[PDB]
Design a protein around this ligand. Sequence first.
Ligand SMILES: [Ca+2]
Ligand SMILES: [Cl-]
Ligand code: NI
Lengths: 106, 106, 106
Amino acid sequence: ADWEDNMETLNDNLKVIEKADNAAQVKDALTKMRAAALDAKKATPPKLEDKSPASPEMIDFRVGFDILLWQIHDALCLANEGKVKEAQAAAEQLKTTVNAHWQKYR
Amino acid sequence: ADWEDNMETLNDNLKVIEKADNAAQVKDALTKMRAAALDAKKATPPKLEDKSPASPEMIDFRVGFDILLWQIHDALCLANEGKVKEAQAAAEQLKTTVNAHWQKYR
Amino acid sequence: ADWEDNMETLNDNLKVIEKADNAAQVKDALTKMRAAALDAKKATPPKLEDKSPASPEMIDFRVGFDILLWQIHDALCLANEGKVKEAQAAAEQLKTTVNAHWQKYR
Ligand SMILES: [Ca+2]
Ligand SMILES: [Cl-]
Ligand code: NI
């Protein structure tokens, strides 16, 4: 999946989490977010297509998904202990990061 | 260590987990798997020895080990809760990922 | 906010941890450490400034930060379970990883 599609997957599951009822839904959405973030590390945003795959710009891009992955880990750790409200609060901070990465590279 | 020896370490510890009797044994095996996966991320597998370390194929290889590392982390989270049987079930998914990586890159 | 400043942030929060009492203090210091390690992972350290960003040296540098990130995660897990003394013992060993990486690449 290209970068834009993976970002769409991230946002779709953020909405799933924000409207969620129980821990299971939150966990399944966070698991899909992790998979999308990892897949996006293999992608190239259109504006960086001319750059080296290991250029500092592309390193920045991939490590931005590492930042997201660690925030996803925190929310999923909260969700697996049944802390659904804390997991949703943390997902709200996930949306800020996702939006910032979207704005930076699109 | 080389990629192939890291892959042996992953397979060996998967067997350890399959037979494990308590949470400390599962945690220990998964910790060794994490070390081997991180070490393998610095390696070049046999299929990609004709590729540059910063080629897209090698970036994708390294992301594949990131994927493995996050699956290891899930099993380790179950084991840290003393849920031995759940963690062994999770390591079933690790086996699929490891075997797929073996077939793709050997 | 370059590599050297991140390594300083890592040492500062390590001192915060080694002189802490409750588990939330340790958690906050480890969370800032995680952020500093991730920022550093996208830097080029002084010793490698004359190397191609595609160099294997730079790949090894970045994987070394992944090793540090999982060590931070293990200490964070000990702290999230209330074992403040164990979190401080683990961070004692993080001190070595952090300062070794510092001295290696400065
Ligand atoms: Ca070669
Ligand atoms: Cl890379
Ligand atoms: Ni965790």
